[PDB]
Amino acid sequence: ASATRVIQKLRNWASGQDLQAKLQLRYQEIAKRTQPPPKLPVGPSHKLSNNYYCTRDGRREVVPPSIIMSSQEKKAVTPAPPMKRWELSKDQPYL
Amino acid sequence: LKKTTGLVGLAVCDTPHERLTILYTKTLDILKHFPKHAAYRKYTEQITNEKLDMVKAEPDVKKLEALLQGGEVEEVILQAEKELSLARKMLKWKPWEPLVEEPPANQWKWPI
Amino acid sequence: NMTLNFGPQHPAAHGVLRLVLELSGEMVRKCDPHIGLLHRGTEKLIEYKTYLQALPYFDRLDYVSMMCNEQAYSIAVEKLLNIQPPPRAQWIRVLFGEITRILNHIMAVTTHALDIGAMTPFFWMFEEREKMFEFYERVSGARMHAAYIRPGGVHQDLPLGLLDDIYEFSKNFSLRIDEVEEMLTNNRIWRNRTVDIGVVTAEDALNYGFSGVMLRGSGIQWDLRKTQPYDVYDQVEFDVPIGSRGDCYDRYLCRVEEMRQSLRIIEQCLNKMPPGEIKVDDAKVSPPKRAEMKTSMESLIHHFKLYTEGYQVPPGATYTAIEAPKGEFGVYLVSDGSSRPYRCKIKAPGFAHLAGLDKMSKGHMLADVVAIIGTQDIVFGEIDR
Amino acid sequence: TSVKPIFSRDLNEAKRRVRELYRAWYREVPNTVHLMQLDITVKQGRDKVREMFMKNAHVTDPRVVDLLVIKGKMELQETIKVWKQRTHVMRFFHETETPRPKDFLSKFYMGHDP
Amino acid sequence: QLITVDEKLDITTLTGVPEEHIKTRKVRIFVPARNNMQSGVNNTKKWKMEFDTRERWENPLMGWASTADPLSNMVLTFSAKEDAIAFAEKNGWSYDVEEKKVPKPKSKSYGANFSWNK
Amino acid sequence: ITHTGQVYDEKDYRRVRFVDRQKEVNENFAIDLIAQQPVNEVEHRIIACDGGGGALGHPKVYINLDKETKTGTCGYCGLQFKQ
Amino acid sequence: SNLIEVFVDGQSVMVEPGTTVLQACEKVGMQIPRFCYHERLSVAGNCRMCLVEIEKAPKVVAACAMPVMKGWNILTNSEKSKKAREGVMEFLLANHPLDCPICDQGGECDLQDQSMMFGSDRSRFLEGKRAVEDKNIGPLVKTIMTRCIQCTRCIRFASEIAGVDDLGTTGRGNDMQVGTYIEKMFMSELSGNVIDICPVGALTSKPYAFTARPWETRKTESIDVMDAVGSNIVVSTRTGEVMRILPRMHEDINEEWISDKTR
Amino acid sequence: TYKYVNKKEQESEVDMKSATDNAARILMWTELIRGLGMTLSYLFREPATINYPFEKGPLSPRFRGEHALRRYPSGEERCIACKLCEAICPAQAITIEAEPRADGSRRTTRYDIDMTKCIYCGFCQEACPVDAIVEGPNFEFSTETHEELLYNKEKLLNNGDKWEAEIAANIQADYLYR
Amino acid sequence: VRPRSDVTHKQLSAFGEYVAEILPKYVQQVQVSCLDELEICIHPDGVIPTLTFLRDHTNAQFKSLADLTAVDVPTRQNRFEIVYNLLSLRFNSRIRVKTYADELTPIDSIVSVHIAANWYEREVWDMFGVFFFNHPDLRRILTDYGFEGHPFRKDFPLTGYVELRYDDEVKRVVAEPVELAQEFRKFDLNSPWEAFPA
Numbered sequence A: 001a002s003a004t005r006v007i008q009k010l011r012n013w014a015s016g017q018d019l020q021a022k023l024q025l026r027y028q029e030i031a032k033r034t035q036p037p038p039k040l041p042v043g044p045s046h047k048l049s050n051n052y053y054c055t056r057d058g059r060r061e062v063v064p065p066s067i068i069m070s071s072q073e074k075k076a077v078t079p080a081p082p083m084k085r086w087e088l089s090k091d092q093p094y095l
Numbered sequence B: 001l002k003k004t005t006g007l008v009g010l011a012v013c014d015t016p017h018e019r020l021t022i023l024y025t026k027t028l029d030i031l032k033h034f035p036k037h038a039a040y041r042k043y044t045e046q047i048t049n050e051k052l053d054m055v056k057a058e059p060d061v062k063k064l065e066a067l068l069q070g071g072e073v074e075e076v077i078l079q080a081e082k083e084l085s086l087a088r089k090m091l092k093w094k095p096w097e098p099l100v101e102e103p104p105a106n107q108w109k110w111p112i
Numbered sequence C: 001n002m003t004l005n006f007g008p009q010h011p012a013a014h015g016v017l018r019l020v021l022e023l024s025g026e027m028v029r030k031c032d033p034h035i036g037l038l039h040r041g042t043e044k045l046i047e048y049k050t051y052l053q054a055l056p057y058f059d060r061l062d063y064v065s066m067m068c069n070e071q072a073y074s075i076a077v078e079k080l081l082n083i084q085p086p087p088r089a090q091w092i093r094v095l096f097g098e099i100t101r102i103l104n105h106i107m108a109v110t111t112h113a114l115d116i117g118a119m120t121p122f123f124w125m126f127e128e129r130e131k132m133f134e135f136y137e138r139v140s141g142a143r144m145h146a147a148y149i150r151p152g153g154v155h156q157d158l159p160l161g162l163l164d165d166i167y168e169f170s171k172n173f174s175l176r177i178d179e180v181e182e183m184l185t186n187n188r189i190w191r192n193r194t195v196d197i198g199v200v201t202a203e204d205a206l207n208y209g210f211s212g213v214m215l216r217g218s219g220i221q222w223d224l225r226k227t228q229p230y231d232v233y234d235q236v237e238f239d240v241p242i243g244s245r246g247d248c249y250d251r252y253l254c255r256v257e258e259m260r261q262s263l264r265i266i267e268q269c270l271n272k273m274p275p276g277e278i279k280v281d282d283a284k285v286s287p288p289k290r291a292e293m294k295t296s297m298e299s300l301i302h303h304f305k306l307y308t309e310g311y312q313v314p315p316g317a318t319y320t321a322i323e324a325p326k327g328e329f330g331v332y333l334v335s336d337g338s339s340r341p342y343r344c345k346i347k348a349p350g351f352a353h354l355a356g357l358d359k360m361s362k363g364h365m366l367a368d369v370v371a372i373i374g375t376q377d378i379v380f381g382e383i384d385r
Numbered sequence D: 001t002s003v004k005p006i007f008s009r010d011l012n013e014a015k016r017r018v019r020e021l022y023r024a025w026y027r028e029v030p031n032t033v034h035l036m037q038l039d040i041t042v043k044q045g046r047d048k049v050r051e052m053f054m055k056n057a058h059v060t061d062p063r064v065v066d067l068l069v070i071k072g073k074m075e076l077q078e079t080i081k082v083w084k085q086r087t088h089v090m091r092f093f094h095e096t097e098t099p100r101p102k103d104f105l106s107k108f109y110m111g112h113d114p
Numbered sequence E: 001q002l003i004t005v006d007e008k009l010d011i012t013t014l015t016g017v018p019e020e021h022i023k024t025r026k027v028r029i030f031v032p033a034r035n036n037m038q039s040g041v042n043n044t045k046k047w048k049m050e051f052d053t054r055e056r057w058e059n060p061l062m063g064w065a066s067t068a069d070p071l072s073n074m075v076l077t078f079s080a081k082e083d084a085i086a087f088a089e090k091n092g093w094s095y096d097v098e099e100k101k102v103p104k105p106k107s108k109s110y111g112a113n114f115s116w117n118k
Numbered sequence F: 001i002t003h004t005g006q007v008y009d010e011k012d013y014r015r016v017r018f019v020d021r022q023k024e025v026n027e028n029f030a031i032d033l034i035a036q037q038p039v040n041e042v043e044h045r046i047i048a049c050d051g052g053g054g055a056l057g058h059p060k061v062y063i064n065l066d067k068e069t070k071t072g073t074c075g076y077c078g079l080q081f082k083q
Numbered sequence G: 001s002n003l004i005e006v007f008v009d010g011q012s013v014m015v016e017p018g019t020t021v022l023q024a025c026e027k028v029g030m031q032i033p034r035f036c037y038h039e040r041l042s043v044a045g046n047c048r049m050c051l052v053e054i055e056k057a058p059k060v061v062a063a064c065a066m067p068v069m070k071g072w073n074i075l076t077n078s079e080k081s082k083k084a085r086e087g088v089m090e091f092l093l094a095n096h097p098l099d100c101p102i103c104d105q106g107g108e109c110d111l112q113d114q115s116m117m118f119g120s121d122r123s124r125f126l127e128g129k130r131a132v133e134d135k136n137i138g139p140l141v142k143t144i145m146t147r148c149i150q151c152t153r154c155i156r157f158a159s160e161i162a163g164v165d166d167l168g169t170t171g172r173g174n175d176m177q178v179g180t181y182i183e184k185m186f187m188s189e190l191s192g193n194v195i196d197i198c199p200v201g202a203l204t205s206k207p208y209a210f211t212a213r214p215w216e217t218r219k220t221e222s223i224d225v226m227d228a229v230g231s232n233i234v235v236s237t238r239t240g241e242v243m244r245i246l247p248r249m250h251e252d253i254n255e256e257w258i259s260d261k262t263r
Numbered sequence H: 001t002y003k004y005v006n007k008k009e010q011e012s013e014v015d016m017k018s019a020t021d022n023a024a025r026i027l028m029w030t031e032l033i034r035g036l037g038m039t040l041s042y043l044f045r046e047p048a049t050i051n052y053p054f055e056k057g058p059l060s061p062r063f064r065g066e067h068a069l070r071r072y073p074s075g076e077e078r079c080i081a082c083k084l085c086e087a088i089c090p091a092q093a094i095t096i097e098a099e100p101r102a103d104g105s106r107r108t109t110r111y112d113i114d115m116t117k118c119i120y121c122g123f124c125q126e127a128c129p130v131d132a133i134v135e136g137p138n139f140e141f142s143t144e145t146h147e148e149l150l151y152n153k154e155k156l157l158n159n160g161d162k163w164e165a166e167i168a169a170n171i172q173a174d175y176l177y178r
Numbered sequence I: 001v002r003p004r005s006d007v008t009h010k011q012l013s014a015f016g017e018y019v020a021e022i023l024p025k026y027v028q029q030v031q032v033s034c035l036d037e038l039e040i041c042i043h044p045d046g047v048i049p050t051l052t053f054l055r056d057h058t059n060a061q062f063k064s065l066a067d068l069t070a071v072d073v074p075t076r077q078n079r080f081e082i083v084y085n086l087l088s089l090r091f092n093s094r095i096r097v098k099t100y101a102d103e104l105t106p107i108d109s110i111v112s113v114h115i116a117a118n119w120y121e122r123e124v125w126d127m128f129g130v131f132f133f134n135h136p137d138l139r140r141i142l143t144d145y146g147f148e149g150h151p152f153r154k155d156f157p158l159t160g161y162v163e164l165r166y167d168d169e170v171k172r173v174v175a176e177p178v179e180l181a182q183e184f185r186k187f188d189l190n191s192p193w194e195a196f197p198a
C-alpha cells in the first residue's frame, strides 16, 4: 500500500487483478500482540463424581486380536461392500 | 460411444458386452478342471456366473456398469482376464491343497 | 549410454539424489536412482525412544509437510491405545493438516519451476509460506518441526487470536495462487516442458504403488481422506481434483487445485471449530495440566510417570495411513506392552514414486528427468528415513 | 538338520561359485586400482582379495557359503560398476587405523579390558 | 529337496560384526532380578542376554562418560532360556546361562501373629 | 570458584582451555542468595509453599513447623518458615 | 491331598490349604496391587489396597490376609475390585506431599506406579494436607516421613527380620506417625533394608540422597565380598562410578537383604 | 466429490474466428505478454523484506529459541535435579549429576545441555516441575567453535540471568494456555 | 475411548475365512485385530500364490502394495516376520499378509505380483538381511556402499561399529572403530507392574 494511485492502477492492470484489495504485506489487520489472557475450558473427566477411571480407560480394555482359521452354498464374500462411485462436483465440475 | 475412460491408460473397448461374455465364458471353462469341491472353483464360479448372467441380462452398458459395479466397463474386462490368468496360475499352484507346513511353535506369539 | 552420475550436481535437489544415468547423447536410456544419501536411522532410533520422544522424529521424516506426518503417528498411537482425541483437537489437526498441505504444494509447484527455470513464482509464494510458518510458530513455538500434534490431541490450545489471522491469510491466498497461474498454467512454455512428459497409465500407477496425486493425476479416484476418513475430514466437504491425460502438466494442475480445495476445508474449520479441550482427559495417555500437577498428587504422579517412562501402549500392531500432501503416509507401528515401540516402518509416499522414475523417464532428455523429479515431490527425508 | 538349499545343494557345488567370484575379483583388482587411481599395488590388492576369500574359509555349511558369494558379488558390482569411490575401497586396506597388538603383555600394558 | 547339515548354524560370517567383538565378548543369559525398591515382578519375567561391560573413561572437555564398546548398551530380550542359548551359538558369542531363581513358596497366615506361644 | 568448588588444579591442563579466555562463572551463588531471605514467621503449625506465583511456581507442599528448635524449609525454594 | 482347587478367574489353580487369596492369584500369574504385604514379613492388612472380589460374595476380601477356600473365584479385575482400588488410591494420595521430584524413590515407587496402573487420573481432595515432623533416625536412613503411608512394614522388619523392636506406631487418627517415640537412632546391622522395604520414599538412604535417579542406573548383578555369607547384590552404576549396591534375592544365601556394611 | 482438471468437456469445432484467435495466440505470443504484465505489476508493489539487524521478524511468546536455567526471585536456582528433563529429552542432550548441597538442599552439581545434540523440541520446557529449564527467546547464539555450543550450568544460569526479564514475560503470557 | 464399528470386524472377519478357504495350502492363521484390521498369515512358500490371488480376484482386488517390512523377533526361530500391507481401491479395504523368514532361508520375491516391491525388498535385504529369490536387482539401497552388517536387526548396535572422519595424512575420509564421546544413556524404563490381563 502507500502507493500513489497511478502506480496502483498500473499494478492492478498489469496484473489483471485488484491486488490492492488483497495485499500480501500485512498492515494493522494482523491480530494485535498481547491478545487478552485465556481461560481455557476443562474437558470431561473433571467431575468430582461418577468419574471412575475404570469406566473411561480404553487403553487396556483392549483385547488380544480375535483369531480365525488358526491352524492349531456358501456365498462369496468381499473384503467390504464394493466402493461407491464418487460424484462430479457441482460448484465446479470441470476446471 | 463414450469418448474415453477416466483412467489414463485404459482405452474404450467397443462391443464391451461381447468382450466380457468371451472372457467370462472362458473363465468358467478353465474353472471346470479345478477339483470338484475345490474352494476357489465354487467361489469364483459363483461370482463369474452372476457377472455373466447380469452381462447377458443388461443390454445398456451404463446400467451394466451400475449392476456389477466395476466403475467403467473397461475395468471389469481387465479384472475378468486378470482373474482368468490367476485361475490358470492356481491350477498349477494347487493352493486348494492342505497347509504346506505348520508354523514353528511360538512363531505367531506377538507379546515377546 | 555414458554414465553421467548426475544429481550429486545439485541439479534437481529436493535433497541429495545420485541419479546414476546412461545417456546416449541427450537421451536417457536408463535411470537408476541411488538412495540413502540421507538415511539417518529414523526407524531404528525410534525403537530406543518412548512414544512421546519419538514424535519429533516424524516431523523430520518429511519436513515440508511437518505436521501432517505427526498426525499419522498420532492416529497410530491413538488406535493402539483405543483412545480418540477431543473434538476441538480433531478440527485443529484438520486445520493445520490443510495449512500444511498448502505449504507442501507451494513447495512442490514453486521448487518444480525453479528447476524448470521459472524463479519468480518461488519468491511470490515463499512470502505466503513465511506467513504460514508464523501460524505454526504462534501455535507451536517452532516455525517448522513444531511437535504440536501429539498422540492424544494437540499440545496446547490455539493462541487467543490465531483463528482470525488464519482467516485474513486464507481470504487472500487465493489471489496469490491465481497469480502463479497467470504466470505458469498457460505459459506457452510451461506447458511444453511439462505436457506429455512422464505419462503414467492408470493400471501401472496402482501396480508400482504410486498412491498420491500421481495416481489421482492418471484419473484413478482415490483420496484416503474421502475413502477412509481420519479425524474430522469426514465432517468437511471438499472435491478431490482428479486428472486425465495424466502427465507432469495435469498433475501440476491437480496440486494447484488441492491448494484451492484446502482453502475450502480451512474456511470451514475456522467457521466450525468447537469449544472444548485439546487433549484427551486420560492422564494415563495425556500429560496433566501444569496447574493440576502443581496442586494435585495424582497429577504429579501421572506427570512424573508420563514424562520419565511413558504411555505403555497395549501390545498390538497397526498400519494407519493418512493422505499426507505427497501421498499415502503410513506408520506400521508394532508395539509390545512397553512404553517404547518395537518397530515403526514409515511408509513414505516417495519410496514408491522414485522407483517409478525409471518407468516414467524412458527415452527422455536430461531436462525431462529434472521435470519428473519435480512432479513426484521427492523429499529425501521420507525416502531415506 | 533338514535344511532347505538356498542356491547350492552341497558345499561342492557352492565352492564352484566361490571359484567364479575369486576369478572375478582377481580380474577386477587391476582395473579398480586404475579407474580409482588408488595408491595400491595390483599384487597387493590381489592378496587382499585372497585374504577376504579365506577369512571365511572355515564355513562348512552350503547355505552360508551361497549367501556369502551373493554378498560378494554385490560388492564387486559396486566396484566394477563404480558406485564405490576410493574412500570406500581403501577402507578395505584399513590404512589409517593403528594396528592393535594381540600379545597379552601388550594389551596388559594398554587396555583395561582385553 | 532339503539338504543335510549337522553344522551348528553359525552365521558369524554373515552378521557383519568386527572380529574383535565376536571373539572377546562374553554375553550372560540371565532373568533380571527385581530392584528391591519396588515389589512388582513384571520385570523378572523375560530372559535377557547382556554383553560383558567395557571401558567407560571420563571425557576431558566436558566430563561426560565415554565408551569405546559398541555392544555395551545392547540387551536383547528372549522369552525362553533355550531360544537365548541358540542366539549365542549362531552369532558365535560365548554364553554363561544363569538358572532362573524364583521366590520359593512361603506359608503365611494372619492368625499366627496372635500365637499363644510363638 | 564455581558453585561447587570446581577449580581445576594448578597442574590440570583443561586450564589451557581458559588460556586466553574467560572461565564462565556466576557471581550470584544460590547457597548464599537463599540465606539472605529471612525466615517467615507463620502462625500455623503447617503452612504451604506453593512456590510463589501458583502455577508459575513449584509444586505445592505443606511444611510442618512444629519442631520448635528448627525451621521448615521448602524442598523446592529453600525458603524457611518458623512458627 | 492337601490341594484345594480355587479358581482365579476360572483357572482352577490348586493350592495347599492355607494359601492366601493374593498367593492364589500369583500362581495363575496375576499380581494383586499391594502395600504393607511383603513375602518375608507378617501379613498386617493395614493398606487394604488389595481388596478383591471373590465371586458370589457381598463384600470384597483382603487378598493378602484371606485364607482361600474351595471354589472361590477371585474376580481380580472385576469392575468392583477396580473401584476398590480407584478409591483406596484416592486416599493414600490425598494426604501425600507431592514432592516426587524430591522423593528419590522417583521411579522406584510402588505408589505412583500402582497409581498409574491401578488408580485414577485425577484428584478430588480439595481440602488441605497434613505434615509430619521429620526424624533423625540415623546417619544412614533419611526419614522424610511426611511421605509414610502407615503401611507398618518397617515396624515389622524392625521386629521380625531384625530384632530391634524399636520402631513403632505412635498415636491414632490421621497423625499416627511411625517413628521412634524418643529420638534413639535405629542402630543395628540389617538397618539399611528399611530403605529397600519402605515402598514410599519417606525414609530413604542419606548417602545416596540425590546422586541419581533409577531409570539411568545400569544394574549389574554381582557378589558381596565384605562378609563371607557371599550375599547376592546388584551394583547400580551410572556413567561408570557405582551409585548404589542394593540386594538381589538368593533364596539360600541373602533372601532380599544385605548388611549395613556392604551397601 | 471429484473435479476434472484438464478435461475438455467437448470438441469445439474450429470456427474461423476461433482459429484466428488461436493463430494470433501462437503468432503474436499473446499469453507470453500476459505473463510479463504480472511481473511488471509486482515490480510496483512494496518489497516485503526487513532490514535484518535493524528490524526483526516477529516471534511470539512460545518461540523455543535458546535454553536457559531460571532462578527464584530470592536468588535460589529453580532446578532441584529431579532429572526428568534428562529423561524426556529426545536427543540425550541434557546430562545431569547431583549431590546434596551443603545447605542440605537438592541441587545439580553438573547440568550440561549439548545444544548441537539438542533439536529444540521444547519438551524440557514442558517436563520441568519447577520449570527451571525454559526455552528462552534468543535464537542468535551462533558460535565460532563447536565447544562453545556445549553449555554447562554456569552458561545456562548466566543465560537465564540475562534473559530472565523477557523469559518471565513470555511465561507470564503463555502459562494459562499450558 | 475410540468409537468402534463391528460392521468392519464382521466384514473383514468373513473375508478372512474366504481367503483362508480359497488358499488353505498356505494360510496358517487369519486374525482381525481389535482395530478392525485383517492379517492373514501365510507359510513362506505361499508368498507368490496368496498375493496373486488378492491382486487378481474379482471378489478381492488388492491392487497396490502399501508396504513390505520385516519385524525381527530375535527369540523367534524364524527371526524375521515379513509383513506385506495391501490396499484395495475397489473395496476400500486393506489386508496384511505376514510370513516368517529366518536369516539364511530366503523368501520368494513378489516383484512379479507388484513392482512396488522392487525397492522395498531391496530395503528389507539391506536392513534385515532376508534374501529374495528371483529379484531383478537386489542390492543395498539405504546403507553406505561399503557397509558391513544389516542395521535394523535387533542384534546390531545403534551407534554401529564404524564412523567416518577426514584424515590429513591420507587426505581422504577414513573409517575407524566407533569411539563415542557420550555413550547413549540406556535408560531402563519398564515398570515392574503390569496393566491388565492382556
Ligand code: SF4
Binding pocket: C301, G096, G097, G098, G099, G100, G101, G103, G104, G105, G106, G109, G110, G111, G112, G147, G199, G200, G201, G202
Ligand atoms: S513416594 Fe516419593 S515418589 Fe512415590 S509418590 Fe510419594 S513422593 Fe512421589
Ligand code: SF4
Binding pocket: G147, G148, G149, G150, G151, G152, G153, G154, G155, G178, G197, G198, G199, G200, G202, G203
Ligand atoms: S516408613 Fe516406609 S515402611 Fe515404615 S510405615 Fe512409613 S512407609 Fe510403611
Ligand code: SF4
Binding pocket: G101, H078, H079, H080, H081, H082, H083, H084, H085, H086, H096, H127, H128, H129, H130, H131, H132, H133
Ligand atoms: S526438570 Fe527442571 S528441575 Fe528437574 S532437573 Fe530438569 S531442570 Fe532441574
Ligand code: FES
Binding pocket: G033, G034, G035, G036, G037, G044, G045, G046, G047, G048, G049, G050, G051, G062, G063, G064, G065
Ligand atoms: S496388601 Fe492386602 S492389606 Fe496391604
Ligand SMILES: [Zn+2]
Binding pocket: F049, F050, F051, F074, F075, F076, F077, F078, F079
Ligand atoms: Zn518454597
